[PDB]
Amino acid sequence: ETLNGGITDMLTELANFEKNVSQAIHKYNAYRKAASVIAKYPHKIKSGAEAKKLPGVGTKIAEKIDEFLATGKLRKLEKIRQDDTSSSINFLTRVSGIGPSAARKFVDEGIKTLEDLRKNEDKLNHHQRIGLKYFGDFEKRIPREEMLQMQDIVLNEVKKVDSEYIATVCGSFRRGAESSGDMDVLLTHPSFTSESTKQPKLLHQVVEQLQKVHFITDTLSKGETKFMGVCQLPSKNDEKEYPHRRIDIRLIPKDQYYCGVLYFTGSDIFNKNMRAHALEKGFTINEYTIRPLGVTGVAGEPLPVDSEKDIFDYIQWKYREPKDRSE
DNA sequence: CATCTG
DNA sequence: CAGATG
Ligand code: NA
Ligand code: NA
């Protein structure tokens, strides 16, 4: 956690690069189990050889570890942090809509900057465009004080469209968090479930209302169950307009809301322990359901859940306020 | 995993 | 349809 930190960090720089710049998914994955294990390792790694002793740790990595321990640096790491091509890819990738793949294409075409991008707006797709247009707003965190106003609007409009909708704002926002990166709404309706064959309108109507009143400004991607967009809190009395914020809305069959809701609220850590505990308690849990574990190895059958309560209950646990869902 | 692009 | 992005 701090004993093999530099090592784990270097390995991470390395892994990322294989994957983003080179195409090296193997190598890339290589660096990763490595950091994973050295990370778990209980002592202070004093040499390559020592590491090498670990699984995932081979000779090449061992080698690297040596030089890093030998000197506060690594040449290769040093070489890469300079390299403009590598840098460009890390940068372009920052735009919503640009993954490594595209980052490579553009670079090879000479687009390496924001400006490059603007000049070449023709080569970018809709998502990518939006991403470019709101590069700044997109990188800005979302303070809870805004978050509450957003939630305030969303929930109100949903209610108006149908009294039966149930919306929830998951994420860190839900666990306390002073700021967040984006708005995540989980949505369901009684008239939508596991069996029930579809109901796209269910999601389209809300999206539409949100646009009606102007809260939603652009569409990144709109499916029949998942909407990805951009929204904005109406600028008050002109002098201070708000940043453009990322937002997602997803329809869920009512028969698996809370597991979803549970799940999305996190944290990853909370999940895990919760998950692991479930298991002890003779249970299974994933994003959509909780199932009674048979003994034959495994088994299933969705347990019936009416709230996040039913869940804990199941695994016989202490109902946790979202704030304390931390770890 | 769901959506988009080409 | 494969392949990309989130
Ligand atoms: Na990106
Ligand atoms: Na292939």
Can you give me a brief rundown of this structure?
K(+) 1 binds at residues 52, 54, 57. With 327 residues, the chain is of the alpha+beta class.
Description:
By secondary structure, this protein is α+β, with helices and mostly antiparallel strands. The chain folds into four domains: 1-83, DNA polymerase, domain 1 (Orthogonal Bundle); 84-140, 5' to 3' exonuclease, C-terminal subdomain (DNA polymerase, domain 1), CATH 1.10.150; 141-263, Beta Polymerase, domain 2 (2-Layer Sandwich); 264-326, 2-Layer Sandwich (Beta Polymerase, domain 3). Helix content is 47%, strand content 13%. The protein contains 15 helices and nine strands. The chain has helices at residues 5-20, 25-40, 48-52, 59-70, 75-82, 84-92, 100-108, 114-119, 126-133, 135-139, 144-161, 201-212, 257-265, 268-280, 308-314, and strands spanning 142-143, 166-169, 179-180, 183-189, 216-222, 226-231, 245-253, 283-285, 290-292. The strands form three sheets. It has a five-stranded mixed β-sheet with strand order 2-4-7-6-5, with helices on both faces. It has a two-stranded antiparallel sheet with strand order 1-3. α1 (5-20) packs antiparallel against α2 (25-40), α6 (84-92) crosses α7 and α11 (144-161) crosses α12. The longest helix has 18 residues, at 144-161. The protein is globular and about 65 Å long. It starts with a helix and ends in a 13-residue tail after the last helix. Bound molecules: sodium ion (2 copies). One sodium ion binds at residues 93-96, 98-99. The protein binds a DNA duplex (6 and 6 nucleotides) through residues 96-102, 125-128, 220-226, 228, 248, 250.
